[PDB]
Design a protein around this ligand. Sequence first.
Ligand SMILES: C[C@@H]1CCN(C(=O)[C@H](CC(=O)NC[C@@H]2CCCN(C(=N)N)C2)NS(=O)(=O)c2ccc3ccccc3c2)[C@@H](C(=O)O)C1
Ligand SMILES: *[C@@H]1O[C@H](CO)[C@@H](O)[C@H](O)[C@H]1NC(C)=O
Ligand code: NA
Lengths: 30, 257, 11
Amino acid sequence: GEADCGLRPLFEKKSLEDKTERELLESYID
Amino acid sequence: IVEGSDAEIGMSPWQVMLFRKSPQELLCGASLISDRWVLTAAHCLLYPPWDKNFTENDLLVRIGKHSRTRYERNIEKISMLEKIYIHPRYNWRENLDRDIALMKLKKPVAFSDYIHPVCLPDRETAASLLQAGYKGRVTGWGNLKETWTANVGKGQPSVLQVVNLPIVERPVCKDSTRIRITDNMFCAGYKPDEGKRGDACEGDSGGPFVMKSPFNNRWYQMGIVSWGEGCDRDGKYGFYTHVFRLKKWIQKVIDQF
Amino acid sequence: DFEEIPEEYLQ
Ligand SMILES: C[C@@H]1CCN(C(=O)[C@H](CC(=O)NC[C@@H]2CCCN(C(=N)N)C2)NS(=O)(=O)c2ccc3ccccc3c2)[C@@H](C(=O)O)C1
Ligand SMILES: *[C@@H]1O[C@H](CO)[C@@H](O)[C@H](O)[C@H]1NC(C)=O
Ligand code: NA
């Protein structure tokens, strides 16, 4: 299928979130 | 990056550094989109008003990097270029319209924890995510201030920098500059009354403006750091190549070559 | 201020 992309081995793939990504997500719901 | 902070290790595994051979200097950012293709700004390679015209042999691409200056022996991969492609209708004369370029690596790179490609957006993603008030992310090793005191002040970061910026309404973009802006650009940054700051700056050019989709958890490259008037000025905004509007060109180049 | 990289890449 389609090559894997935009899923970071050290974050999404280990269910960890980076220090400021929540700021991006919250911007969607204002 | 002005008013950003230090990236965490592996936070931007698609960030690429464009590196000049002689003299050794940082030229620009870029992003990894597959194992053999790198996406950057056209003006990183070709700008005749300052006699800039770089060739496949003038440049190295460095991938997987965290530090600006170190040779990160275990982690980074250094690649040579097979071929550069610049948008045929790239307008360097008046407004940097279609500021986009592709580069094909001589050999494919192995992915790892520190090297991984970003997604390009489809139509539904572009329409959902590219709206005024939504925030994307810019990364790079460019300057920390527009100007600083020589041999005293900061200047360049020692590690990759990151900043989150909101997309700004098209009419506010238009009013802020005398340059003729096209539909192949958007602008991002905080407004003077919002009390937060941040911008890209010299050396960040060609780097990715990325957004995360909350429904599939993936990162998408929506923009390329293109141009601005100074760095982090009040009433001023950075401008970004509109990646989706130019996807058909990317598609042509990758398919034929 | 760049650390040097193998000279194969720079020759
Ligand atoms: C040809 C380069 C493009 C980017 N750039 C420029 O943007 C120059 C110098 C600069 O402040 N770089 C600083 C930053 C470099 C990328 C990010 N950007 C943001 N603030 N977001 C500005 N500006 S400009 O007002 O002189 C300008 C703006 C638009 C223009 C369109 C066509 C032709 C010339 C223009 C010149 C210069 C740079 O090398 O940094 C030169
Ligand atoms: C820049 O250099 C290339 C390769 O050396 C040459 O073929 C091309 O004509 C030049 N283009 C411009 C706009 O100077
Ligand atoms: Na600004």
